């Protein structure tokens, strides 16, 4: 029985609706559980889903130690990390990633019918307010960016005690709906939102690029085996099917 | 020395301008040549560039036999494939790809300041005409697309909306109420030379170019790590603006 570390994140991993207490894997549902089920069928394994105790994806601290799902893999307390775990340079040094089951990037959430076309257009004015989730990977991107357009945007975002920023995605979406505000976040989030709000849309293309992949400890045999399975699922069109099932609104 | 197979394709790989005949790697320049240089300064290796003899990227015939750069990697006549090589399922069965060093696809070239936000908006109206260059890669997509929103667009392109080359499509946009559907690379080209035009929305039929290695290559993981390092450093973006 494999130990699968994961994290609550709509619509990847969610508590299953019930009128009676549930136990084990039946407690959870979502894109990642459907993915995991398929993985266990193709590769032939038993698995137990365990939410990461600290509720974090994985980062380094001041002392240089890891936490979250990344740490659970490193310490071999989990065989697989099946969650929207971002494939990054720093993580690739301590854990292994399969082929990304999903590709994405930073983009713009805003209203329909407006003349705004791109990040370029947001940066050249101060009327339409814009920002991102505080201390998220999107804010970090703009914070470190040496691109002139994104430097101008960051200087704006951080001005006036960072009032343009928001606490989380839910707050950000609400701000977009209620005020004249454009939110910067992952294209996966934006589509989840736009499918459930018919007067919102994505503006422009992807600002950066990365992927979500299944994480394994370094040197694990499951790394190659999952990549093979994901390729098969991609070829069958099942990955597109799975995304459609959980992303569509009504 | 590592043998690097590649293919001529502007502006990834091009012949270097010269008064005299050039030799070796200096014969070539472009986006992929810069990437190859940076990759060699991260991993640390020597390399010899060799154009794929048949001039093909890599496809399979009726017997399932491969050609092009893909075949060169299979036969171990090349250690790396640094080129605009599309990451596809059938290719991933026989060779290894790194993480994409470039993401592209189909998008819309149109005017600035308009209420148009996506391909969906064009598909649900008719006043603004839209199309693509005939029998181009963009056209081939919409045809063999079993996605109705793109089928409905193709139905409208089939009713004149198509153009001969990218050069006609550009001017047709500038002069008429027309939206041009083309590869995102060709768009970035145009929008830099025409300040009144812009890309509308994101990518359609999105795909990635990855570095190719033979299956079981010891450079695989190293290349992926290097590319991650390069894009997160923002050097891949810088390389793009340099050659586009
Ligand atoms: N809701 C968004 C992103 C979810 C999300 C939020 C924070 C993350 N932090 C990490 O460190 C990581 O690897 N992945 C993460 C994914 C979506 O639906 O794609
Ligand atoms: N001109 C465009 C795309 C170049 C291009 C054209 C045909 C291809 N055919 C393949 O099979 C393949 O793998 N890559 C290919 C790349 C650009 O500048 O990016
Ligand atoms: Cl919260």
């Amino acid at each position: 029985t494999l130990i699968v570390t994961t994290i609550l994140e709509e619509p990847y991993v969610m508590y299953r609706k019930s009128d009676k207490p549930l136990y084990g894997n039946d407690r959870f549902e979502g894109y990642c559980l459907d993915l995991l089920k398929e993985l266990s069928n193709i590769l032939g394994f038993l698995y137990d889903v365990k939410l990461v105790p600290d509720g974090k994806y994985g980062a380094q601290n001041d002392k240089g130690e890891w936490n979250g799902m990344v740490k659970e893999l490193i310490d071999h307390r989990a065989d697989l990390a099946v969650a929207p775990l971002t494939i990054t340079y720093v993580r690739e040094k301590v854990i292994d990633f399969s082929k990304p089951f999903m590709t994405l990037g930073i983009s713009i959430l805003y209203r329909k019918g407006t003349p705004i076309d791109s990040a370029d257009d947001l940066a050249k004015q101060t009327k339409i307010e814009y920002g991102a989730v505080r201390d998220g990977s999107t804010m970090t991107f703009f914070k470190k960016s040496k691109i002139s357009t994104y430097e101008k945007m960051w200087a704006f975002m951080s001005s006036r005690q960072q009032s343009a920023l928001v606490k989380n995605s839910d707050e950000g979406i609400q701000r977009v709906l209620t005020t004249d505000y454009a939110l910067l976040m992952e294209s996966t989030s934006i589509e989840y939102v736009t499918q459930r709000n018919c007067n919102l849309t994505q503006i422009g293309g992807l600002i950066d690029s990365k992927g979500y992949g299944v994480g394994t400890p370094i040197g694990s045999p499951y790394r190659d085996k999952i990549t093979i399975a994901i390729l098969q699922l991609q070829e069958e069109g099942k990955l597109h099917m799975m995304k459609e099932k959980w992303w569509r609104g009504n």
Side-chain angles (χ1 to χ4, degrees), chain A:
Chain A
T1 296
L2 298 186
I3 295 296
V4 178
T5 190
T6 187
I7 191 180
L8 293 162
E9 199 79 54
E10 187 186 26
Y12 307 90
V13 178
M14 307 176 300
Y15 281 121
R16 188 184 300 263
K17 297 297 181 174
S18 181
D19 309 85
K20 188 73 174 298
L22 303 183
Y23 313 88
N25 302 342
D26 193 23
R27 294 171 297 172
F28 312 109
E29 73 173 1
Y31 176 91
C32 286
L33 279 305
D34 286 21
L35 175 59
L36 184 49
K37 164 193 163 300
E38 293 289 343
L39 293 178
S40 71
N41 265 306
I42 299 170
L43 300 174
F45 60 78
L46 295 164
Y47 62 93
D48 251 273
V49 175
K50 163 166 185 175
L51 294 172
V52 53
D54 61 35
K56 299 193 181 305
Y57 286 83
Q60 294 191 275
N61 59 6
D62 189 46
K63 291 285 175 292
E65 277 280 18
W66 288 94
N67 62 2
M69 288 184 301
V70 172
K71 189 58 163 56
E72 309 308 307
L73 294 171
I74 297 169
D75 287 10
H76 280 58
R77 285 193 299 269
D79 299 89
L80 305 186
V82 182
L85 186 63
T86 311
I87 298 176
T88 67
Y89 175 70
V90 291
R91 291 173 177 170
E92 273 271 20
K93 291 183 173 178
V94 294
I95 63 177
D96 283 344
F97 289 94
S98 63
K99 175 182 178 301
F101 54 86
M102 198 176 287
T103 185
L104 82 180
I106 299 177
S107 190
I108 303 175
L109 177 72
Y110 192 53
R111 302 180 182 270
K112 291 182 171 179
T114 75
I116 304 299
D117 297 310
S118 59
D120 209 272
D121 287 325
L122 288 180
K124 62 200 288 291
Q125 58 84 69
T126 60
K127 179 55 182 296
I128 304 175
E129 198 163 1
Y130 60 92
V133 172
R134 212 184 320 264
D135 298 342
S137 64
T138 294
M139 191 215 66
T140 294
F141 174 85
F142 283 94
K143 188 179 183 182
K144 68 188 178 188
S145 184
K146 293 177 171 54
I147 317 301
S148 69
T149 296
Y150 306 147
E151 281 178 348
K152 283 178 57 65
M153 293 177 62
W154 170 242
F156 174 83
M157 290 190 217
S158 54
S159 74
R160 309 157 306 175
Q161 314 165 245
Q162 307 183 130
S163 64
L165 304 187
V166 296
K167 181 187 185 307
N168 49 45
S169 65
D170 288 33
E171 172 175 315
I173 301 156
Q174 272 295 288
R175 188 170 179 176
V176 169
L177 291 163
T178 301
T179 74
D180 201 342
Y181 181 75
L183 181 66
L184 280 139
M185 58 181 187
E186 310 302 333
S187 49
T188 44
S189 288
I190 299 181
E191 185 174 86
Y192 195 78
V193 174
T194 55
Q195 281 284 322
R196 289 156 178 79
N197 291 274
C198 292
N199 48 76
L200 299 190
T201 180
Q202 171 175 310
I203 299 301
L206 300 189
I207 295 183
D208 77 326
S209 281
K210 60 262 191 176
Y212 289 153
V214 172
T216 74
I218 293 186
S220 175
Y222 278 103
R223 164 183 160 164
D224 278 25
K225 299 179 181 179
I226 292 171
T227 287
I228 290 176
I230 292 181
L231 286 165
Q232 170 180 342
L233 292 167
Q234 191 176 17
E235 164 263 305
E236 296 187 86
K238 296 207 170 187
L239 286 186
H240 177 82
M241 189 278 304
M242 292 182 216
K243 202 196 182 198
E244 275 275 41
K245 171 179 297 178
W246 295 99
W247 263 253
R248 78 165 60 256
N250 250 322

